[PDB]
Design a protein around this ligand. Sequence first.
Ligand SMILES: Cc1cc2nc3c(=O)[nH]c(=O)nc-3n(C[C@H](O)[C@H](O)[C@H](O)COP(=O)(O)OP(=O)(O)OC[C@H]3O[C@@H](n4cnc5c(N)ncnc54)[C@H](O)[C@@H]3O)c2cc1C
Length: 375
Amino acid sequence: GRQKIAIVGAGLGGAAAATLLQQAGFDVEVFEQAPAFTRLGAGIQIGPNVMKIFRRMGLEQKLELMGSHPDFWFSRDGNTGDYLSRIPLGEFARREYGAAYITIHRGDLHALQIEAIQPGTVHFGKRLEKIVDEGDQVRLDFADGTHTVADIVIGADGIHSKIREELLGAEAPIYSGWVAHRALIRGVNLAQHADVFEPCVKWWSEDRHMMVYYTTGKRDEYYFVTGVPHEAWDFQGAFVDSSQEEMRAAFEGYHPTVQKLIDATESITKWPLRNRNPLPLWSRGRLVLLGDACHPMKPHMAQGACMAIEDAAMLTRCLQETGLSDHRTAFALYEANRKERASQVQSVSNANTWLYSQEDPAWVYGYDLYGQQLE
Ligand SMILES: Cc1cc2nc3c(=O)[nH]c(=O)nc-3n(C[C@H](O)[C@H](O)[C@H](O)COP(=O)(O)OP(=O)(O)OC[C@H]3O[C@@H](n4cnc5c(N)ncnc54)[C@H](O)[C@@H]3O)c2cc1C
């Protein structure tokens, strides 16, 4: 008796799903390949639509205390500093969308999310190598020679998803012609230029950009992440070190505020971004996918983790409707209730002009996931 869910991947999507599903009364364990838990030294942006999901988890208030609450998102021209858009966030967002827009330290958010999972149910050092849906249950084999069995398996295992591979076979090669540079800035370097350093700003030019925001309400730590054309990635790491000289050449011509940020860094890392992504895969048999395993996308709108967390919330609602004994109905309802919004996000990402002009972002931030009728 008593049915079991195995989740592969303890990233933001897998850890959200584990929390929501356990809080709903399901029996859930999580299997993560990393040998240890790492707090990523990076920021992340979380819109009101996802703060409403952290609310269900009991984490919204804590995240509000930890994060920065920008009053606006500014899009600015990279060369001139002209204001291309002034998107109201802050108290306007709280009233209009029903929750805060925050920017926050991603590693600390991630730790808080894993700490909401029942102790004894998250297993590190478990890299899935083989999975077989035997028809009435699924067996999972890990690289350390252990295994586990479950009634359904959630593929929360990211763009390199092994669940996706077991279903579709080996994915065609995808190359990388662009990178994201990442840096955290603190210090007198930050204090010296605090008057010109706005809380949430995207600096744009013809073929590249730099996004910048604070990670905490103290505004003592300032983060940037870029998107920049780059030669094909052939390094073994998921990242490599970059340098100020690299960044200053890539951002030649940008406004003095951006040059000040580059000069203020101590350590920059570079991350490969894929040129292409496959079409969504939602479920097959006893396997269901969420987040970057399901609908990998270019990072143009920076809503990927938010979409993974929305997936987790909607999947939980659908399993609450059907129970685990009727997983095929749940998995069908999940896809039916997510695919159009995922497709709108895809189409707007393709245009790559999100908040470049003074547009109304309500369709993203005002979305009411728990209000949607599953039908
Ligand atoms: C430059 C950039 C900026 C971004 N900014 C934002 C932002 O501000 N806001 C936002 O919402 N999103 C943002 N995103 C998108 C976001 O990072 C991703 O969409 C999100 O991480 C997807 O979460 P996930 O849980 O689906 O996958 P992941 O975060 O990739 O997690 C997958 C997990 O599965 C594990 N795993 C993989 N293979 C296996 C295996 N075989 N066995 C076991 N475990 C395995 C991995 O180790 C990992 O822990 C950005 C992305 C980029 C590239």
